Amino acid sequence: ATRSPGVVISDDEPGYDLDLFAIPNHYAEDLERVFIPHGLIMDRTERLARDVMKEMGGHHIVALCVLKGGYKFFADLLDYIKALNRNSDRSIPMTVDFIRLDLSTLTGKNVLIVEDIIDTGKTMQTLLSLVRQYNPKMVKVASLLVKRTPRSVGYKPDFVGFEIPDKFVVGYALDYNEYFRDLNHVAVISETGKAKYKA
Amino acid sequence: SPGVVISDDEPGYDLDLFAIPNHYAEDLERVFIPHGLIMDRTERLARDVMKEMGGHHIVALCVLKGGYKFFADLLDYIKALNRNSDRSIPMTVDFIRLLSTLTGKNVLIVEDIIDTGKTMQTLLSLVRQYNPKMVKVASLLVKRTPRSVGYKPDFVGFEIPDKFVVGYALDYNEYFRDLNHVAVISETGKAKYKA
Amino acid sequence: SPGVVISDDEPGYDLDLFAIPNHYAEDLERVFIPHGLIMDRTERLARDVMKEMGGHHIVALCVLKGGYKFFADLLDYIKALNRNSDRSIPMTVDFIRLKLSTLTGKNVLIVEDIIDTGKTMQTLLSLVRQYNPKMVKVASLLVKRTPRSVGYKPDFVGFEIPDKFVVGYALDYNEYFRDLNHVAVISETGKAKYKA
Amino acid sequence: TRSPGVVISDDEPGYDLDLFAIPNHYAEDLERVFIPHGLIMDRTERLARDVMKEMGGHHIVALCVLKGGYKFFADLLDYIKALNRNSDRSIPMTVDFIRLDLSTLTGKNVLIVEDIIDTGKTMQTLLSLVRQYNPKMVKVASLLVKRTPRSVGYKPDFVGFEIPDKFVVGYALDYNEYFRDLNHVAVISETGKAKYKA
Ligand SMILES: Nc1nc2c(ncn2C[C@@H](COCP(=O)(O)O)OC[C@@H](O)P(=O)(O)O)c(=O)[nH]1
Ligand SMILES: Nc1nc2c(ncn2C[C@@H](COCP(=O)(O)O)OC[C@@H](O)P(=O)(O)O)c(=O)[nH]1
Ligand SMILES: Nc1nc2c(ncn2C[C@@H](COCP(=O)(O)O)OC[C@@H](O)P(=O)(O)O)c(=O)[nH]1
Ligand SMILES: Nc1nc2c(ncn2C[C@@H](COCP(=O)(O)O)OC[C@@H](O)P(=O)(O)O)c(=O)[nH]1
């Protein structure tokens, strides 16, 4: 719930062609276009980590990961946060948990909920109400990707990595029928790939 | 077979030989395994896993909560092998709170440290009862301790002396998370960060 | 292909979207290519290089000076491909000064960090060709769309950028901005701040 | 100039080959891995801050000696540039290459970067040639110092690893331009010496 919408990727002109970057060859016909390369994600994630310690560094941080199979972004975000802490000459305690949808550990602490993708946003909103119930000092939501979808409730994430168009993306932290885990770029899935690896 | 064996006669490296956080200067006695050495070993471990379990679909279970870090890096190296194999390979990723889906599947249990070995032996008995095709355990650290039952993981990163270590994936009252290397905690550190 | 094309519509990113050293906050105007984007593109360039001339032994020549980071990273990806090729592939690595008989009959890769007008490379190619090499191709990280270009185009291009003076990654300004890992447009303030 | 760096003892040196990831085409060409790639990186990171605390106050001249190697110089520079990001001032730095315009060294902090020091004759030859251009401060960094009686008694200001007297390859150390894709420092085998002979 802040002004920064993050790195915007418009419907006019999105992403780069597949030939310009290194894609696993078994995914050659399963993707349409690359929206966000792995390294671009890392750079943005590094800035997000500095945004988090800027607004939440005041109290003991509880980093809360959602278990959607996507551990990748949560692990990367935390790595950058730890990188900041090791050069702060104060030893900074931090606890990390996981939620699948005892939380008494959240009382009076800065809670950071980390999400990979936000589409409808009611999965996210549902989690705020449960965490706020345990009376934390503050709750912030980090999201790597926010899709511009008509299924928008109106809820706005605090820390956003990228704002992407309404396409079904896979890669990096997002999978499809447990496929595309070895793909480190965020790319749009094709009709071929959507049918080939269908459940 | 027992992994990289860190003997008892001299225990890793001096603190000033590597870059440790300044606020952990007095809280450590010695560095056993530098971060880079862990990563290079884990890359080989990932190759060993694909060797004995790459036959069928792999369900990788992370034991919560001793440390997520080793699990994250182990799977990163596994995916690296998968994307260069000219073959679309699916993989299940799950976490254990300490589940009947595990029936007839190739299950990989990932632990960051094994001390006595009783936690893992207990976890194994619970998993086998759901009749999995194969269950193997990967452990980053196995300690040489007289308090051990006799359990040995299928995959071992390092065999270390009987000393309380922190860093990389092992914390102490939610401290030392920002420490990359595996180091022995000092008596100062134990008392400074007690609960 | 001309590589990744950065148009002049409204390119780059706001400085607030990425991590930038605080002592460079006022000295930069906009970030064109983040460090990670350079690396992902460079990895692909390494693949392209190890296909048009990466058959056997190559001689990789880095132009001095102007940069070194791009040459180091490009070779790191090349060496990463070689160690998965199931074949021991030797490689010559050396640097060239622009004011050498080894190049005779060799497969030469000239690595450059940026190409503006292109006369430096045209001049460089004409001299190398006189030593009669088996083949000489040029890889460049950046190629600027400038009205000043003679018309030279490299065999391999990383990014095509607007006619703006950029610093970072492998490009400096009076030996400053070396610690800046993103490619960014230097501001008027910084340009005057770090003058020679 | 008396911290010998990470000492690798000689009764049992390094690690077995099967414990780490080694390129398949080098499987028979090596005997023993001394220093894994990641261990080099961690040590190099520490070296980078040793350098910056002594010399790195202001403007330094990073001088690389060309052996066909460059990897260590590039990695050491990367860690140094990583430190200067968290400094609260902009640090200028010049990087150059020399094989044995040197008026540019006068009155500046000169850092000579070496990958391997064996007898040490190369370094003291180079030192005597640099110190006569009157630099404000000239010091030597070396990734590897071999422990050999053939040494002329020269010791570098900054040392990464002190290794036994064996012929090592990998990471910034080639053998007839081979082993460049090997990221670990390993001992070359007899099969390797003949397989990649000139
Ligand atoms: N790979 C991929 N997955 C996506 C995409 N968009 C949504 N998802 C999954 C969704 C939860 O999954 C619903 P299900 O399949 O489990 O029923 O995530 C958003 C929810 O958290 P929201 O905020 O409530 O909308 C996408 O573009 N690519
Ligand atoms: N950081 C750190 N932690 C250690 C160390 N040795 C043991 N632990 C914790 C122990 C579980 O701790 C129970 P708790 O008291 O924390 O609740 O893990 C081993 C069991 O899984 P085991 O195999 O059954 O013995 C150590 O050297 N360093
Ligand atoms: N950092 C930075 N440097 C730039 C830029 N554009 C040009 N240069 C330098 C120029 C050579 O330097 C001339 P000097 O400084 O020695 O006088 O490189 C182009 C020649 O190779 P070209 O192809 O012949 O035009 C730029 O945008 N950023
Ligand atoms: N790969 C590899 N190379 C080594 C090793 N030990 C020495 N070298 C080369 C030597 C110069 O090479 C002489 P050449 O054969 O090229 O003529 O470097 C040391 C001189 O700088 P020093 O200090 O004066 O003795 C080693 O263990 N492995």
Exposure b/e, D152-176, CB count within 10 A at least 16 = b: eebbbbbbbbbbbebebbbbbbbbe
Does the annotation place A121 within a ligand binding site?
yes
Distance between Cα B112 and ligand 2 center (Å): 10
Task: Give me ligand 4 centre to Cα D33, in Å.
Answer: 19
- The number of CA neighbours under 13 Å toward the Cβ of B119 is 19
The DSSP H or E segment spanning C128 is helix C119-129
User: Other C-beta atoms within 10 Å of C148: how many?
Assistant: 10
Q: What distance in Å separates the CA atoms of residue D181 and residue C82, rounded to the nearest whole number?
A: 6
**DSSP letter, residue D30:** E
State how far the Cα of D36 lies from the Cα of D66, in Å rounded to an integer.
23
Pairing of strands A61-66, A94-99: parallel
CB B60 within 8 A of CB B50: no
Which residues are bridge partners to D158 per DSSP? Answer: D141
| Burial grade of D147 (CB within 10 A; 0-12, 13-18, 19 or more) | middle
CB A50 within 8 A of CB A18: no
∠ CA C40-C41-C42, rounded to 5°: 90
Q: Output DSSP code: residue A4.
A: -
Say what the alpha-carbon torsion angle B185, B187, B192, B194 is, to the nearest 10 degrees. 80
Residue type, B99: L
| Beta carbons of C35 and A47 less than 8 Å apart | no
Q: How far is CA C52 from CA C61, C135, C155, C170, in A?
A: 16, 11, 10, 25
Residue D197's closest CA among D29, D62, D69?
Answer: D29
d(C-alpha C174, C-alpha C120), whole Å: 20
**Best of A62, A84, A86, A179 to mutate (most B CBs within 10 Å, chain B):** A86
For chain B, give the longest Cα–Cα distance. Answer: 53
DSSP 8-class letter at A100: -
Contacts of D186 in chain B (CB under 8 A): none
Q: Among residues B147, B63, B140, which one has the least CA distance to residue B97?
A: B63
The helix or strand, by DSSP H or E, that contains position B191, with its residue range, turns out to be helix B187-192
Instruction: Give the distance, in angstroms, between the CA of residue D197 and the centroid of all CA atoms in the same chain.
Output: 24
The pair of structure tokens assigned to A173 is 């932290």
Residue carrying the six token digits 């490619």: C183
* Position D174, amino acid: D
The 3-state DSSP class for residue B164 equals coil
Of all atoms in ligand 3, which is nearest to the CA of residue C161? 27
CA atoms of A194 and B2, how far apart (whole Å): 44
What technique was this entry resolved by?
X-ray
**The Cα angle at residue B63 between residues B59 and B66, in degrees rounded to 5:** 150
* Structure token pair of residue A31: 């993707």
DSSP string, B42-53: HHHHHHHHHHHH
For residue D164, the ligand closest to its alpha carbon is 4
B113 contacts: CB under 8 Å, gap ≥ 6: B66, B67, B139, B140, B141, B142, B143, B165, B169, B170
Question: For residue D62, what is the DSSP state?
Answer: E
Contacts of residue B66, Cβ cutoff 8 Å, sequence gap at least 6: B111, B112, B113, B169, B170
Cβ burial of A71 (10 Å; 0-12, 13-18, 19+) is buried
Residues of chain D by 3-state class (helix, strand, coil), percent to 5 = 30, 25, 40
Q: Decide: D164 and D8 in contact? Cβ < 8 Å.
A: yes
For C68, half-sphere exposure in the C-beta direction (CA atoms, 13 angstrom radius) is 26
Report the C-alpha gap between C151 and C146 in whole angstroms: 10
What are the CA-CA distances from residue D54 to residues B98, C194, D48, D136, D153 (Å)? Answer: 51, 24, 10, 13, 23
CA dist., res. B114 & res. C135, Å (int)? 57
Contacts of B13 in chain D (CB under 8 A): 6
Sheet holding B91-96, edge to edge: B4-5, B155-160, B134-143, B106-114, B58-63, B91-96
Q: Among D72, D61, D150, which Cα is nearest to D116's?
A: D72
CA distance A11 to A37: 17
| Atom number in ligand 1 closest to CA A121 | 23
Element (H, E) at B78: helix B69-82
- Please tell me the distance from the alpha carbon of residue A182 to that of residue A170, in angstroms, as a whole number: 10
Provide the b/e sequence for C36-50 (b: ≥16 CB within 10 Å): bbbbbbbbbbbebbb
Angle at the Cα of A123 from the Cα atoms of A7 and A116, rounded to 5 degrees: 35
Q: Is C90 exposed, middle or buried (0-12, 13-18, 19+ CB in 10 A)?
A: middle
Radius of gyration over every alpha carbon of chain D, rounded to an integer in angstroms: 17
Nearest Cα to Cα of residue D31 among D186, D157, D198: D186
Angle between helices A38-56 and C35-52 (to 10 degrees): 170
Dist CA B119 CA B132 (whole Å): 19
Closest by alpha carbon to B92, among B114, B81, B108?
Answer: B108
Dig out the tokens for A80 from the structure.
């950058």
Exposure of B34 by Cβ count < 10 A (0-12 exposed, 13-18 middle, 19+ buried)? Answer: buried
Cβ–ligand 1 distance for A169 under 6 Å, the answer yes
Distance CA B28, CA B25 (A): 6
The residue among A116, A111, A144 whose CA lies nearest residue A128 is: A111
Say whether C17 and A46 touch across the interface (CB within 8 A).
no
CA B94-B95-B98 angle, 5° bins: 140
Mark residue C155 as left, alpha or beta (left: phi above 0; alpha: psi -120 to 50; beta: remaining).
alpha
Beta strands in chain A (DSSP E): 7-8, 31-36, 61-66, 94-99, 110-118, 138-147, 159-164, 169-170, 186-189
Cis amide linkage into residue A109, ω under 30° from 0? no
Give the dihedral of Cα atoms D69, D71, D74, D79; nearest 10 deg. -140
Closest CA to C162 of C1, C41, C10, C2: C10
Type and span of the H or E element at C143: strand C135-144
What's the per-residue H, E or C state across A16-54? ECHHHCCCCHHHCCCEEEEEECHHHHHHHHHHHHHHHHH
Cα separation, C119 vs C38, in Å, equals: 25
Closest alpha carbon within chain D to C79: D181
Neighbours of A82 (CB within 10 A): 18
Q: Give me ligand 1 centre to Cα A118, in Å.
A: 7
Q: Which residues contact D27 (CB under 8 A, 6 or more apart)?
A: D17
Q: CB-CB: which of D6, D21, D42 is closest to B36? A: D42
Is the preceding peptide bond at B152 cis, omega within 30 degrees of 0? no
Distance C100 CA to ligand 4 centre (A): 23
Is B115 annotated as contributing to ligand binding?
A: yes
The Cα–Cα gap between A91 and A82 comes to: 11
In angstroms, the CA B60 to CA B96 distance is 10
| Residue type (1 letter), A82 | K
Which residues of chain C have a CB within 8 Å of the CB of D96?
A: 65
Helix (H, G, I), strand (E, B) or coil at C5: strand
Cα–Cα distances (Å) from C79 to A38, C90, C93, C110, in that order, read 20, 10, 12, 16
**Residues of chain C found within 8 Å of residue D95, distances taken between Cβ atoms:** 68
DSSP reduced 3-state for C22: helix
DSSP C60-119: EEEEESS-SHHHHHHHHHHHHHHTTTTS---EEEEEEE---GGGTT-EEEEEEEEESSSH
At residue D46, φ and ψ (nearest 5 deg) are: -65, -40
The distance between the two most distant Cα atoms of chain A, rounded to a whole number of Å, is: 53
Catalytic site includes residue A119: yes
Amino acid at the residue B109: I
Q: How far apart are CA B87 and CA B91, in angstroms?
A: 13
Q: Measure D44 CA to nearest chain C CA, in Å.
A: 16
Mapped onto helix, strand or coil, the DSSP state of residue C149 is coil
Strand, coil or helix: A55: helix
Which chains neighbour A (Cβ–Cβ under 8 Å, 3 or more pairs)? B, C
Closest ligand 2 atom to residue B111 Cα is 21
In this structure, chain B runs to a length of 195
Ligand 3 binding pocket, CB closer than 6 Å: C 114-120, 165-167, 171, 173
- Token duo for residue B150: 């006799």
Rounded to whole angstroms, the Cα distance separating A144 from A65 reads 12
Q: From the CB of residue D21, how many other CB atoms can be counted at a distance below 10 Å?
A: 19
State if residue A146 touches ligand 1 by the CB under 6 angstroms criterion: no
Instruction: Report the residue of chain D nearest C61, measured CA to CA.
Output: D68
Buried/exposed code over B86-112 (b: 16+ C-beta within 10 A; e: otherwise): eebbbbbbebbeeeeebeebbbbbbbb
Q: Which mutation among A33, A117, A174, A178 tests ligand 1's pocket best, with the greatest number of atoms within 8 A of CB?
A: A117
Task: Please state the residue numbers annotated as binding site of C for Mg(2+).
Answer: 172
**C-alpha neighbours within 13 Å on the C-beta side of residue B48:** 23
The experimental resolution of this structure, in angstroms, equals 2.6
* B149: DSSP letter: -
Question: Judging by DSSP bridges, how do beta strands C91-97 and B155-160 pair with one another?
Answer: unpaired
The CA-based diameter of chain D, rounded to the nearest angstrom, is 53
What is the phi-psi region of residue C20: left when phi exceeds 0, alpha when psi lies from -120 to 50, beta otherwise? beta
| Neighbour count for residue C97 (Cβ, 10 Å) | 10
Q: Structure tokens of C34?
A: 């983040």
| Token representation of residue B81 | 């092998």
Contact C135, C108 (CB under 8 A): yes
Contacts of C97 in chain D (CB under 8 A): none
Q: Is B119 annotated as a binding residue?
A: yes
- For residue A92, the number of C-alpha atoms closer than 13 Å in the C-beta half-sphere is 19
- Joined together, the tokens standing for residue B88 give 């679309």
Q: Rounded to an integer, what is the distance from CA C166 to the centroid of its chain?
A: 12
